[PDB]
Amino acid sequence: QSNRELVVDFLSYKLSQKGYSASGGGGGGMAAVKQALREAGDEFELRYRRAFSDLTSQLHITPGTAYQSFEQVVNELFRDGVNWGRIVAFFSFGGALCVESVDKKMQVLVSRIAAWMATYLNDHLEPWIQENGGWATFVELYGNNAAAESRKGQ
Ligand SMILES: O=C(NS(=O)(=O)c1ccc(N[C@H](CCN2CCOCC2)CSc2ccccc2)c(S(=O)(=O)C(F)(F)F)c1)c1csc(N2CCc3cccc(C(=O)Nc4nc5ccccc5s4)c3C2)n1
């Protein structure tokens, strides 16, 4: 439940930044994790994503795209090991795929990408997350981004 809630919150937040409204982006026991993931995704996208190969050039999702194709491109993030920055990059990449889907009139793919992300998180990332301090350690590492909060009037 918590991992699905994190996926749906992040995707709702990323869609909101492009004027799109999806459910699941309101609190709950994972509120601090949702906030840290949202801020880390923004900070990654603003400053650090530019250093890396743009995964959106390799995967343009249509209703015929298979999970296996998404899995192979997402695997590039983790080939040299899982870490928190690569996990944030995975959420950011899923968010960009959802924005592209709505932009292209394929909004039915948002729920499919959310399911694909929850499956990938479960199969490939959760053992690392839970044996490397859990989401609690990610929150401790990231803290809060006061400059971004001030910029957004938060
Ligand atoms: O090793 C890494 N990072 S790390 O060293 O572990 C670290 C560094 C600092 C931080 N956090 C500070 C936080 C400092 N602020 C200061 C202000 O107050 C708040 C804190 C800076 S913000 C940030 C930077 C990187 C990642 C996430 C966030 C945190 S982090 O946030 O995960 C941590 F929790 F560890 F802190 C992790 C790292 C990150 S990504 C990465 N890879 C390597 C393998 C690979 C291969 C092929 C392609 C890509 C790829 O990403 N392509 C993409 N294309 C698209 C296209 C569209 C949409 C999304 C995407 S993503 C990548 C990405 N390797």
Residues composing the chain: 154
State in Å: Cα 84 to ligand 1 middle: 7
And the tokens for 108? 């039915």
Q: What share of the chain is helix, strand, coil (3-state, %, to 5)?
A: 70, 0, 30
The dihedral formed by the CA atoms of 122, 52, 58 and 86, expressed in degrees to the nearest 10: 0
Virtual torsion, Cα 22, 77, 63, 107, nearest 10 deg: 10
Count CB-CB contacts under 10 A for residue 151: 11
H-helix segments, the chain: 2-16, 31-43, 67-78, 84-103, 109-120, 126-131, 134-142, 146-151
Q: Which residues contact 99 (CB under 8 A, 6 or more apart)?
A: 14, 15, 18, 20
Instruction: Provide the token pair at 124.
Output: 């490939």
Distance CA 50, CA 121 (A): 24
Experiment used for this model:
X-ray
Kindly report the protein residue whose alpha carbon is nearest to atom 3 of ligand 1.
85
Q: What are phi and psi of 7, to 5 degrees?
A: -60, -50
Resolution in A: 1.4
